[PDB]
């Protein structure tokens, strides 16, 4: 009548019989140890850089226990509920016999966070002189309050490596001379083994490991305010934005979708000239047309005024800044702060010829516009040259975010007075000692050859994944991601539970852009974020 898990009319199959030997005995071609090629060797969880700069104390690696360590264990957890057991570790430094410096590691018990101080060293540790050749293997025991910790669980028995004895070389002279590269290899403990398993494609009621956010490679980064990939990194006192912005609670900060699509909107022929905006065909916000930029106009002005720019132009790279030349009316371009789009055109009532595509987010008052930091149904903007008749409707909409209007050295959306708030503009005041950041981006200009920057709040892949999965992260806790280039410069970014990024540095600029990036888990918000620049 019923159907207990696995049972029922069994039969094998026609001339079917899996009769060992041919199976089992087909193992001969291997020499296999057990059903765990896992516990047998180690992998490369990661490698840290050690330079003649950092001073005796600063911790170099602060990893916490959990399958996230060894990759195969990692690649398996995607099938289980919780784990248990220790993890054998082997690490070694790849330095040169000309160097000099000791290093020690310690197994910090669950519940405490190390401190960049020598005293913290007094504890059963393992030295490792820079000259050491044969690597050293020790174990990370599973000291656990519970019977087993399931996937997440932050309070694991963490490991750590700090500078026991400053590393120096008998060759001073230059700046950040050099250093050596260290590496940590993990091996699944002999007493480690998972436990109950997960039902494929299920969601962990307590969030997943946030570590997976941004691309482990610069190249295909790109922002959210705009599609152009990240150009540089900029730091400021405060950071505000919302449109292509998402949060850990997946709160719709803005009104657009996690990606980029051609803004398409119908409109009515204002019977005048520059026509009436407001419709919003393909959008998930009553009115507010997903895709509209966070920028508007700063000074109320008329859409009328052809040919403005500065002066003649051609005398490019003419270090401006005003004060006080009289010839190149720097700034003004009649109607700046605009959004040039590749529009389709209208249609319906027929006869026409593309063009147009100059928008903003203000308000329609015949010949004037006048801004507003508040965006509602009837606030979008456009431009035209679709001569009036009987006044037909349903336009051929569409257009794409392409250009802006050469204001000045102002990186797009550099001020609150510019940000098109929808309801609540989420900012970000420094935490602990760290400072918020921004993602510099490029944006094509309109009158000039090529120019102007744009401030982005978060990488596209960030917003993307942030609006789908669910990663539980404490309130006052970050998200440790190590970014690096090629020269040797390395720092961290701790994502905020609000969707922002932080760093603990004063200023950086000149770096081999072809970067890379990983994640070292997540630490508190107060503690800073060491780094290496200059």
Distance CA 38, CA 186 (A): 10
Does residue 510 belong to the site contacting its own copies (CB under 8 A)? Answer: no
CA 488 to chain centre: 21
DSSP per position, 141-198: ----SSS-B-S--S----EEEE-SS--B-S--SSSS--EEEEEEEEEE-TT----SBP
Q: Which of 63, 295, 356, 462 binds its own copies (CB under 8 A)?
A: 356
For residue 403, state whether it binds its own copies (rule: CB under 8 A).
yes
- For residue 172, the minimal CB distance to its own copies (Å) is 26
Question: Taking CB under 8 A as the criterion, which residues in 185-204 touch its own copies?
Answer: 187, 191, 193-204
Give least dist CB 169 to its own copies, A: 20
Cis peptide before 324 (omega within 30 of 0): yes
The nearest distance, CB 161 to its own copies, in angstroms, is: 13
Q: In the numeric block, which tokens belong to residue 344?
A: 């389709």
Report if residue 456 touches its own copies, rule: CB under 8 A.
no
Tell which positions 372-391 bind its own copies, by CB under 8 A. 374
Q: CB under 8 A: which stretch of 45-53, 167-175, 324-332, 394-402 binds its own copies?
A: 394-402
SS3 72: helix
314 touches its own copies (CB under 8 A): yes
**Residue 349 contacts its own copies per CB under 8 A:** yes
> Nearer to its own copies by C-beta: 145 or 319?
145
Q: Which is nearer to its own copies, 242 or 532 (CB)?
A: 242
Say whether residue 94 binds its own copies (CB under 8 A).
no
Instruction: Give the residue among 157, 66, 67 at the shortest CA–CA distance from 108.
Output: 157
- What sign has the CA pseudo-torsion 16, 20, 21, 26? positive
List the one residue from 33, 58, 96, 109 that touches its own copies (CB under 8 A).
109
- Terminal-to-terminal C-alpha distance of the chain: 76
Q: Is 525 in the site for its own copies (CB under 8 A)?
A: yes
Query: Does residue 399 bind its own copies (CB under 8 A)?
Result: yes
Q: Does residue 229 belong to the site contacting its own copies (CB under 8 A)?
A: no
Residue selected from 99, 128, 226, 481 as contacting its own copies according to rule CB under 8 A: 128
Distances (CA, A) of 384 to 17, 183, 358, 387: 78, 62, 8, 8
Contacts of its own copies in 268-307 (CB under 8 A) = 285-286, 306-307
Verify binding: residue 329, its own copies, rule CB under 8 A.
no
- Please pick, from the candidates 168, 180, 370, 472, the single residue that binds its own copies as defined by CB under 8 A: 472
Residue 194's nearest CA partner among 140, 137, 142 is: 142
Give the shortest CB-107-to-its own copies separation in angstroms: 4
Using CB under 8 A as the binding rule, the residues of this chain from 6 to 45 that contact its own copies are: 6, 8-23, 25-30, 32, 35-38, 40-42
Q: DSSP label at 229?
A: P
- The Cα diameter of the chain in Å comes to 97
- Quick one: 344 or 370, whose CB is closer to its own copies? 344
**Which positions from 411 through 450 interact with its own copies, judged by CB under 8 A?**
416-417, 423-425, 427-432, 444, 446-450
Neighbouring C-beta atoms of residue 324, cutoff 10 Å: 5
Q: Which residue among 57, 100, 135, 258 contacts its own copies (CB under 8 A)?
A: 135
Of 171 and 181, CB closest to its own copies: 181
Residues touching its own copies, count (CB under 8 A)? 184
Residues numbered 157-186 forming contacts with its own copies, rule: CB under 8 A: none
Place of tokens 């720097």: 330
Nearest Cα residue to 310 out of 285, 336, 291: 336
The strand pair at 480-484 and 46-51 is best described as unpaired
Pick the binder of its own copies from 55, 122, 173, 319 (CB under 8 A). 122
Which parts of 45-64 interact with its own copies (CB under 8 A)? Answer: none
The phi and psi torsions of 275 (rounded to 5 degrees) equal -95, 175
Q: Specify burial of residue 233 (Cβ count, 10 A radius: 0-12, 13-18, 19+).
A: buried
Half-sphere exposure of 201 (CA within 13 A, CB side): 0
């Amino acid at each position: 009548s019923i159907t207990t898990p696995e049972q029922g009319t069994t039969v094998g199959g026609v001339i079917a019989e899996p009769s060992v030997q041919m199976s089992a005995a087909a193992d001969m071609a291997t020499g296999k140890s057990v059903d765990s090629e896992w516990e047998a060797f180690f992998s490369f969880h990661t490698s840290v850089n050690w330079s003649t700069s950092e001073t005796q104390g600063k911790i170099l690696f602060k990893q916490s226990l959990g399958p996230l360590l060894n990759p195969y264990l990692t690649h398996l957890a995607k099938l289980y509920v919780a784990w248990s057991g220790s993890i054998e570790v082997r690490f070694s430094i790849s330095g040169s016999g000309v160097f000099g410096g000791k290093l020690a590691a310690i197994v910090v018990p669950p519940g405490i966070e190390p401190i960049q101080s020598t005293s913290m060293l007094q504890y059963p540790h393992v030295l490792f002189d820079a000259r050491q050749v044969e690597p050293v293997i020790f174990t990370i025991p599973d000291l656990r309050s519970t019977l087993y910790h399931l996937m997440s669980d932050t309070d694991t028995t963490s490991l750590v490596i700090m500078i026991y004895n400053d590393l120096i070389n008998p060759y001073a002279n230059d700046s950040n001379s050099s250093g050596c590269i260290v590496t940590v290899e993990t091996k699944p403990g002999p007493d480690f083994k998972f436990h109950l398993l997960k039902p494929p494609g299920s969601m962990l009621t307590h969030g997943s490991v946030p570590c997976d956010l941004i691309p482990k490679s610069s190249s295909l980064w790109i922002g959210n305010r705009f599609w152009s990939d990240i150009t540089d990194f900029v730091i400021r006192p405060f950071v505000f934005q919302a449109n292509r912005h998402f949060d850990f609670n997946q709160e719709t900060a803005g009104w657009s979708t996690p990606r980029f699509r051609p803004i398409t909107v119908t409109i009515s022929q204002k019977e005048g000239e520059m026509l009436g905006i407001g419709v919003a065909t393909d959008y998930i916000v009553p009115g507010i047309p997903d895709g509209w930029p966070d920028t508007t106009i700063p000074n109320e002005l008329i859409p009328a005024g052809d040919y403005a720019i500065t002066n003649q132009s051609g005398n490019d790279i003419q270090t401006k800044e005003e004060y006080e030349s009289a010839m190149i009316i720097s700034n003004n371009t009649n109607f700046k702060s605009m959004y040039i789009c590749g529009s389709l055109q209208r249609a319906w009532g027929n006869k026409k010829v593309s063009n147009t595509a100059f928008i903003t987010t203000a308000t329609v008052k015949e010949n004037k516009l006048i801004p507003s930091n508040t965006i509602d149904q009837t606030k979008i903007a456009i431009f035209q040259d679709n001569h009036v008749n009987r006044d037909v409707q349903t336009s051929d909409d569409t257009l794409a975010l392409l250009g802006y209007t050469g204001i000045g050295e102002e990186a797009i959306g550099a001020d609150r007075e510019k940000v098109v708030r929808i309801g609540v503009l989420p900012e970000a005041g420094a935490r602990g000692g760290n400072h918020p950041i921004f993602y510099r981006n490029s944006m094509k200009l309109g009158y000039v050859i090529k120019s102007i920057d744009v401030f982005n709040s978060q990488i596209l892949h960030t917003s993307r994944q942030l609006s789908l999965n669910n990663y539980l992260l404490s309130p006052d806790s970050f998200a440790v991601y190590r970014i690096i280039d090629s020269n040797g410069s390395w720092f961290d970014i701790g994502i905020d539970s609000d969707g922002f990024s932080f760093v603990g540095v004063s200023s950086i600029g000149k770096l081999e852009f072809p970067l890379t990036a990983s994640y070292m888990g997540n630490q508190l918000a107060k503690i800073r974020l060491a780094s290496n620049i200059r």
